[PDB]
Design a binder for this molecule. Structure first.
Ligand code: XPF
Ligand code: GLU
Ligand code: GLU
Ligand code: ZN
Ligand code: ZN
Ligand code: ZN
Lengths: 258, 257
């Protein structure tokens, strides 16, 4: 049968082609995860359908209703067979879905508007003039929520009670907030997305300091799915054959504008 | 009692200065010694650290198809788990299970300071400076299997080089760089390279970018019940910042250069 692939509109992972309206099915999209999905399916020998996650979310469990939203929810509730997206491997998610070995490394990082007097998470935590936040329903927000590290707990105490909200609905909203806030907003996001934006016009943002953590994106499947084993072996093969390195260069650096 | 196979490789597992008056697990120290203690505490098991008998990581003999090293100890039922700088590879994942990686690394170049080499391309385009890798390891297999022009050229040279450019242990490779007056460069994992760069006599250096990007995983026999719990422990330890704390403790807080 045709494998239902859940994914998310996040640059440069998955984007609508400029002429998408004249195209059909998988042909409407382009990006790192579109190329990776095609390679995994070809190596595993399956037909697939890319579907954009209905709620536009990565995946979090609602504290009250206990329902998973986002791509994680699409896998948990049987709406999709596999997630091929910049989906972070986390302990809470691994308890409900399976992940392949990581296909890409990343860490939480700081995005500033160029010229902002901030060099680290410690600098953000020790001041009040520059506001800062994260994506409202992903792994970055959960990292701060759960952190027992002094600087990060201090950052979370501030973010959770900041008014108006420092949290954003999408990466693009966070980026637009940095760009329009004249250096008064810094955005906390994954190093991969931060490095991509730093290489795009208007070239007015920058990644500053080291990463706050070290983790990876994994291809996700429903718990105990038969696809899990084959997909993990495909990620290992593609890494060893240099495909993953070739795709990162194609989507980040080969088409850099700065 | 869980039998843990591991390897004497700095700063992962090392005999303590006073090992002779110490017994069992207490004889050893290092990143993987601290990691084994953390995993066992979180998973609730007793364990015995045992050093791999042949001193190898693990490769399959082309003729007999027999696995050696820590991989072989798991395959043949001699050990329950491997907690070591054991590279996750496709050929190994076909015979043993690996947790998600607990540490990242790439193949890198070690030179004696002042050696006129900046990259793998520089090594491949000359003959004055010899270069090699560790035997029965994933670095050697990377060059053996590579279809990338520079790396295939490097392998063609290394496989036929006389005298041999390959070494039995990392320490032998490091000692060869140090004694060869800049005429030998060693190809090894960035983790081991960065550790040696921070140790006396401070005469080596990591040069250029990494040739690949991969990780070390905790390994168990295929279908072992321990695999699931150990993978969850690695994810928890990463999230708590314990993996970062151990890397800092063993590499940079213990810096001599
Ligand atoms: C054999 C490979 C498929 S792999 O599983 O090693 N993944 C590689 C594919 O691209 C790059 C690398 O991704 C990684 C992504 C994340 C990590 C980390 C784990 C724990 C950390 C800490 N603290 S950082 C390692 C490797
Ligand atoms: N990759 C993240 C989304 C982005 C973020 O949280 O910064 C996730 O899987 O939740
Ligand atoms: N970590 C490697 C050994 C070192 C090397 O090959 O450079 C392995 O697991 O085989
Ligand atoms: Zn392919
Ligand atoms: Zn602990
Ligand atoms: Zn033989």
């Amino acid at each position: 049968k045709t494998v239902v692939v859940t994914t998310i509109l996040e640059s440069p992972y998955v984007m609508m082609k400029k002429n998408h309206e004249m195209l059909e099915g998988n042909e409407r999209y382009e990006g790192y995860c579109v190329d990776l999905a095609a390679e995994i399916a070809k190596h595993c020998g399956f037909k697939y359908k890319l579907t954009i996650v209905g709620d536009g979310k990565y995946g979090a469990r609602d504290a009250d209703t206990k329902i998973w939203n986002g791509m994680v929810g699409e896998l948990v509730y049987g709406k999709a067979d596999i997630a091929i997206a910049p989906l972070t491997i986390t302990l809470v998610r691994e308890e409900v879905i399976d992940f392949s070995k990581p296909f890409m490394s990343l860490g939480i990082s700081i995005m500033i508007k160029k010229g902002t007097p901030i060099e680290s998470a410690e600098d953000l935590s020790k001041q009040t003039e520059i506001a800062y936040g994260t994506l409202d329903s992903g792994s970055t927000k959960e990292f701060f929520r759960r952190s027992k590290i002094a600087v990060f707990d201090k950052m979370w105490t501030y973010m959770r009670s900041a008014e108006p909200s420092v949290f954003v609905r999408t990466t693009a909203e966070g980026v637009a907030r940095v760009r329009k806030s004249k250096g008064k907003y810094a955005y906390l996001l994954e190093s991969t997305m931060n490095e991509y934006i730093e290489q795009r016009k208007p070239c007015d943002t920058m990644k500053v300091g080291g990463n706050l953590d070290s983790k990876g994106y994994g291809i996700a499947t429903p718990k105990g799915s038969s696809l899990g084993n084959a997909v993990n072996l495909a990620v290992l093969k593609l890494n060893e054959q240099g495909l993953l390195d070739k795709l990162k260069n194609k989507w980040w650096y080969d088409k850099g504008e700065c």
